[PDB]
Amino acid sequence: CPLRLRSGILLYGYPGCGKTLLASAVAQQCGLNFISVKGPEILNKFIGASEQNIRELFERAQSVKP
């Protein structure tokens, strides 16, 4: 395949609509390294740290298999 395949997809819907459950389940349904992070956890009152945490999470991602 000569074109980079669509990799990222967003989710959005009603509250408590199982989006969390679907995200949890897709880890085993296919079987991969499921890196998980919340919204606030990345953000920290120390400037730089908020972007730094996401950057190092992506470093971890590049570290391992898909």
């Binding site: 000569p2 074109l3 120390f46 400037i47 730089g48 740290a49 972007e51």
Partner: protein
């Protein structure tokens, strides 16, 4: 570069993107004409500061920069604006100084700031909460203004989507001279070229028209 770091260039060339017809001349004149004609151009006069992009998002600006770097094969580094900012002022300025001076050590080279908008805004416009950026932007200014004196073989490129917020001190020639554009393709020929480049590698059935 590996010893120095950034291998960023994955894969790109002119065939990999379209709509470069009009910009080709200006970018090539800014980049390679001195490369092919350096000694002739050695007249001790102001060299072209660099390049500055803008327009709708997704217009291929970053792909365009990567294609420039790969095709012309000059040492490249990608600076993601937010990655610079540290918890407090100063150390971000130190980071900017060290990156620029190490680039000035690796000469000739190409340098591009990705989304300059988020690290070079119009300070004062947005609610100044801490005034942190005021000082970081200051960094770039002088180190951009100090490039022409000695740092020959290094040139700057910028990518923007909301250029209405860029600090004006940058826009001055010497700091920035060529405000290049990359937007929506107007005529069917533009999209035709962009598409034949888009499907250049496709294994298409003859039914494709």
């Amino acid at each position: 570069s590996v010893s120095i770091g950034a291998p960023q260039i994955p894969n790109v060339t002119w065939d990999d993107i379209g709509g470069i017809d009009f910009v080709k001349g200006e970018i090539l004149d800014t980049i390679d004409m001195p490369l092919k004609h350096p000694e002739l151009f050695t007249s001790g006069m102001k060299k072209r500061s660099g390049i500055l992009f803008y327009g709708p998002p997704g217009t291929g600006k970053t792909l365009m920069a990567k294609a420039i770097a790969t095709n012309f094969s000059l040492n490249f580094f990608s600076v993601k604006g937010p990655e610079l900012l540290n918890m407090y002022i100063g150390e971000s300025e130190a980071n900017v100084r060290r990156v620029f001076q190490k680039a000035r050590e690796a000469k000739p080279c190409v340098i591009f700031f990705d989304e300059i908008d988020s690290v070079a805004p119009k300070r004062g416009n947005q609610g100044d909460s801490g005034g942190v950026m005021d000082r970081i932007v200051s960094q770039l200014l002088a180190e951009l203004d100090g490039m022409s004196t000695d740092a020959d073989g290094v040139f700057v490129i910028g990518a923007t989507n909301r250029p209405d917020l860029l600090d004006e001190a940058l826009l001055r020639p010497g700091r920035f001279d060529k405000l290049l554009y990359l937007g929506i393709p107007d005529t069917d020929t533009k999209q035709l070229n962009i598409l034949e480049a888009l499907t250049r590698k496709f294994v298409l059935d003859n039914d494709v028209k």
